[PDB]
């Protein structure tokens, strides 16, 4: 019933931008935080940032501040991440994930991830 939905992929050109979306259902969108995470081959996870959907307030990984922009659309219950001036370092899988910030403090439900591929 809890579901985070993300599109499967983006094939984009160096230096363009993309807007990544993550649609939540089966729960009260404003009662949990939403995080974005990067997974590059043979590595793990890099935390991008978080957004409080109820206040639209954001916290970013200093590494990603001049790169990513987190927003929501409360009525459509969708979280977005925009990525600017995409380079080779930007090819990876990007996940949205729910954090029970007021409950038991777990990243319990995860989207399936959108694979971003930069190529000319």
């Amino acid at each position: 019933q809890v579901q985070l939905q993300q599109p499967g992929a983006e094939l984009v050109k160096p230096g363009a931008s993309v807007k990544l979306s993550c649609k939540a259902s089966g729960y009260t969108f404003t009662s949990y935080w939403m995080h974005w995470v990067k997974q590059r081959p043979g590595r793990g996870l890099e935390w991008i940032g978080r957004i409080d959907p109820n206040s639209g307030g954001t916290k970013y990984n200093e590494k990603f501040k001049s790169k990513a922009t987190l927003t929501v659309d409360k009525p459509s219950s969708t979280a977005y991440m925009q990525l600017s001036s995409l380079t080779s370092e930007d090819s990876a899988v990007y996940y949205c994930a729910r954090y029970d910030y007021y409950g038991s403090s777990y990243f319990d439900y995860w989207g399936q991830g959108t694979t971003v591929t930069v190529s000319s």
Binding site: G44, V93, S104, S105, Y106, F107, D108, Q112, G113
Partner: protein, 108 residues
């Protein structure tokens, strides 16, 4: 901060195994809200433990988090082949989260 986990562990069905999560800057405390996440073949992630020892609903009994010494740890009792996956831990440092490198667990 750097979070380090064993790169790989190998166990056998029915055996007990413990994986750990260590911090660069000192001992890991509840204030770090240690999380354990499971990644299964093709990029399927499930949260398993949060706030150092809270099992997520649906997660079998055989898994449990705790602090052992200066590190966060996840123990699996009577490991099944099903449990074969990559386990990540995440630690919280006041203005951000940091993930460990992951432990690939092989179940012979």
């Amino acid at each position: 901060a750097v979070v380090t986990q064993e790169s790989a562990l190998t166990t056998s069905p029915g055996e007990t195994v413990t994986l750990t999560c260590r911090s660069s800057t000192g001992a890991v405390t509840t204030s770090n809200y240690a999380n354990w996440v499971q990644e299964k073949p093709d990029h399927l992630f499930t949260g398993l433990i949060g706030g150092t020892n809270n099992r997520a609903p649906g997660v079998p009994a055989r898994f449990s988090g705790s602090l052992i010494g200066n590190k966060a740890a996840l123990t699996i009792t009577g490991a099944q082949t099903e449990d074969e996956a990559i386990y990540f831990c995440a630690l919280w440092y006041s203005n951000h989260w940091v993930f460990g490198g992951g432990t690939k667990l092989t179940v012979l």
